[PDB]
Predict the structure of protein (homeobox ventral nervous system defective protein).
Amino acid sequence: GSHMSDGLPNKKRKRRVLFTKAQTYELERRFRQQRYLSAPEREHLTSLIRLTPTQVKIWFQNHRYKTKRAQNEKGYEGHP
């Protein structure tokens, strides 16, 4: 059956957005087997959680900067 709305203009020019803890998950796993996704590396994912190739790289950017804060935190956090 037709369970996919192809009307994209029916929406306004605004609407928050996120990712299935799943996407972001595999999509986060890629960052492991690859730290510099490209045009051919990303795609591999685009097969997984469809994060369209470029969209895949566009996401890394957001993490690239934060993926650095994680290492700064990481550890047990607190005072051992």
